[PDB]
Paper text:
In this study, we determined the crystal structures of E. coli (S)-ureidoglycolate dehydrogenase AllD, which forms oxalurate in the presence of NAD+. (S)-Ureidoglycolate dehydrogenase AllD belongs to one of eight clades of l-sulfolactate dehydrogenase-like superfamily. The dimeric structure observed in the asymmetric unit represents the functional unit of AllD, consistent with size-exclusion chromatography, in which AllD eluted as a dimer.
Specifically, NADH adopts an extended conformation and is located on top of the central β-sheet of Domain II, with its orientation perpendicular to that of the β-strands. NADH is buried in the pocket such that only 10% of the possible surface area is exposed. In particular, the nicotinamide ring, which acts as a hydride acceptor or donor during catalysis, is located on top of the N-terminus of β8, and its position appears to be stabilized by stacking interactions between Pro158 and His44, with further adjustments by hydrogen bonding between its carbonyl and amino group to His116 and Ser140, respectively. Compared to the apo structure, the side chain of His44 moved out by 1.2 Å, accommodating NADH and forming a possible stacking interaction with the nicotinamide ring, while Asp174 rotated its side chain as much as 4.0 Å toward NADH and hydrogen bonded with the hydroxyl group of ribose, adjacent to the nicotinamide ring.
Numbering used by the authors:
A (entry chain B): 3 to 315
B (entry chain A): 1 to 337
Write the structure that this text describes.
Amino acid sequence: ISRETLHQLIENKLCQAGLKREHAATVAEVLVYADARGIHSHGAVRVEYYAERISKGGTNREPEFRLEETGPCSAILHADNAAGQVAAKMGMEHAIKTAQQNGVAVVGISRMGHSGAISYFVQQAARAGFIGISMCQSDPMVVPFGGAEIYYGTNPLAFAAPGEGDEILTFDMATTVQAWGKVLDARSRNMSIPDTWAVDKNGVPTTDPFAVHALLPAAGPKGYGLMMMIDVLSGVLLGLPFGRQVSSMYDDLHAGRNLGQLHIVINPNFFSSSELFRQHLSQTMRELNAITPAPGFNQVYYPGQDQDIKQRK
Amino acid sequence: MKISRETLHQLIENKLCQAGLKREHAATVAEVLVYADARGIHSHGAVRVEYYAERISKGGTNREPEFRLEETGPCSAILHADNAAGQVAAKMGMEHAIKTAQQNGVAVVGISRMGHSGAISYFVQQAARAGFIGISMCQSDPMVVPFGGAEIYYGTNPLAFAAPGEGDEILTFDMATTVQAWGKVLDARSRNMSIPDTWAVDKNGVPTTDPFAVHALLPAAGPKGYGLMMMIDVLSGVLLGLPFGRQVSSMYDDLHAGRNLGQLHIVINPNFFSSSELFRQHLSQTMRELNAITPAPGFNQVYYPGQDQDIKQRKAAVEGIEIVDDIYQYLISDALY
Ligand SMILES: NC(=O)C1=CN([C@@H]2O[C@H](COP(=O)(O)OP(=O)(O)OC[C@H]3O[C@@H](n4cnc5c(N)ncnc54)[C@H](O)[C@@H]3O)[C@@H](O)[C@H]2O)C=CC1
Ligand SMILES: NC(=O)C1=CN([C@@H]2O[C@H](COP(=O)(O)OP(=O)(O)OC[C@H]3O[C@@H](n4cnc5c(N)ncnc54)[C@H](O)[C@@H]3O)[C@@H](O)[C@H]2O)C=CC1
C-alpha cells in the first residue's frame, strides 16, 4: 500500500461522496500524512466518517471561501464549513505568502470541519523555510482542573521549524493527558485504563474506560490553561462559539461544525540569519539525540523524532 | 512579615539604585518584582534583589545599556537590550509590541541580550490592559533533562498569556515548562523535606525524592513540556541569533558578564479580527462559567486559569504583600551583598 495508493483511494471515495476532486485530494493528503506517523487515529480510519458527513451536508461540499485580509500580517479565511483539511491548508498557504513578504502572519480559519493531525499544516510552513504554529478548538470533552463538568476540548497545539536540507523539527500535542482516540482503543479491548487519563461523571479519576465521562487536562492546571489559550486564540478571537459551546462530532451530522483554527507563521529573516537559524535547528536535533539516556530509555529523541522515524518506515 | 506595595517597591528601588542602576530602571525592576510577590510568585520576587545587586555591582547587568529598537517589518522588531536588566528590556519591548499591534494588528518582538526578567506574566498583562492579547516566553538557565534524558539542555523556559475581559478584568496564565519551578526544590532545601519523585532527577537521570540529590528538573507532562521548552528556546533564542539550549548562561556562571538571554513577545489586537466588545464579554463569560463548574470531590471550587493568583493579588492590596523577613532586613541595610 503506497502513499500514492491511498491518496487515490481516498480521493476517489471522497470525490464520489460529494467533494470537488481537488478538495478530495487535499483531505486525502492530510489523512495519508497522519497514518504514517502513528497518528492512525487521524488517518484513513476516518474516511468513512468524513464521507458520511459530506453526504449529509454537515460538511460543505460547495463552500464559498472568502480570504479577508485585515492587516499587513493578519487575515481570516471564512471557510463556510468546508472540510477542515481544505480550509486549514488554504489558510496556511495565505499565512506562508504573508510571512514571506511581510515577516509574520496570524491567520484565523473561521467555520471549518475537523482538520485532523494539525502538524500537517505547520510542516507546510517549515517546508517553505518558516516557523509554523497552529492550534484549534475541539469537541468539549475535558474537565477544568478541579472540576466535574466538561468545558474545553482536546485542543491541540503544533509547531514546526526548518533545519538544514530537508530536515524539519515537528512537535504536535493534545492538551489532555492522552488523546481521546486511545480511550476507545482501550474501550475496544476491555483493558483497564491508567487513572491519569480520565474521570467519571463525578469528576473522580477512573480505571474503567466505560465509566469515563471526561478527560483530564495534561499537567493539571497547565493543560487547563493551554486549552483555554487555544480556545481564546482560535475561537473567541474569531467570534466563533467557544468553550462548551463548541460543536461535537456526533451532535448533528447535517450541521456544519463551525470550528476555528489559528495559524501563526514567522519568517526567520525578519529576526536573524536564516542560514544560521537552520544550522542551529539541525544542531539542536543532533545534540538532543546525543544526550545520555536516562535508565529505561534506549535513546533520547528530539521532539517529534519518534513520529519522523515511523513515517519513514 | 506582610508589607505594603509602595514600601516594598521603594525599598527594592533604593537597593538597586544603590547597586548602580538608574532610579527609573530600578523602579521598573521593582515594579515587576512586587507584582510577582503580590501574586505569590515569590521565587521571582524581592528574593532576587540581593543577587541582582551583586550582578549590577559587578557589571554583569548593564547600568548604561545602549538600547536599540530595530524595526524589521510592519509587525516585527528586535529590541537590542545590551544586557540591561531583564525587567527593563522586556517591558520596553512590550511597549513597542503594543504600539505596533494598535497600528498594525499584530506584533512579534524579540528582546535580544537581556538579564533575568522575572515573572513574565507582568509583560502580557501590559498588553491586556491595552485591550490586546499578550503572549510571552523566554529562555532560562539550563536545568532540565530532555524527555528520556539524563543530561541538562533547556531551562524552565516559561510561557505566559493574558487576554482582557470587560472593564478591568484580565485572564492571566503563566507557567514554567517543568513539572515544578526550581524554587520549589529550593524551598524543600530550606525546609529539609522529601519532595515528590516527579519533579526532579539525580545526576544519573534517576528520579529522586531528596532535594539535595537533584541534578536537573523533569519537563511537565513528559514529552509535551519537552516540546514546549524547545519551542520557547527556538522562538526566543535561536530565532534571535542568541545562544540556545545548553549554551544559555547560568545565573552564577560569571557575575561580571551579561546573561545574553532572549525573550519573545507576541501581541494580537482583537479589533483586527472581530468585535472587541464581544471578545471581552466572552472572556468575562469564560471566567464566570468556569468558576461555576461543579467541583470534583476534594475541591471546594473550580477556578478559571490564573484565578488563584488573582485572588492572592486582590488579598495583597488589602492585607499587604508577604515576603520573608530576611529580605526586608537586607533591603533596609546598607549591605549590598
Ligand atoms: N480536534 C483535533 O483536530 C485534534 C487533533 N489532535 C491530534 O492528535 C494528536 C495527538 O497527540 P498526542 O496524543 O498528545 O501525542 P503524544 O503524547 O504521543 O506526543 C506529543 C508530542 O511529543 C512527541 N513525542 C512523544 N514521545 C516522544 C519521545 N519519546 N521523544 C521525543 N518526542 C516525543 C510526539 O512526537 C509529539 O510531537 C496530534 O496530532 C494532534 O494534532 C488532538 C486533539 C484534537
Ligand atoms: N527565567 C524566568 O524568568 C522564569 C520565570 N518563571 C516564572 O515562574 C513562574 C512559574 O510558574 P509555575 O510554578 O509553573 O506555576 P504554577 O504551577 O503554580 O501554575 C501555573 C499557572 O496555572 C495556574 N493555576 C495553578 N493552579 C490553578 C488552579 N487550581 N486553578 C486555576 N489555575 C491554576 C497559575 O495561576 C498559573 O497561571 C511564572 O511566573 C513564570 O513566569 C519560570 C521559569 C523561568
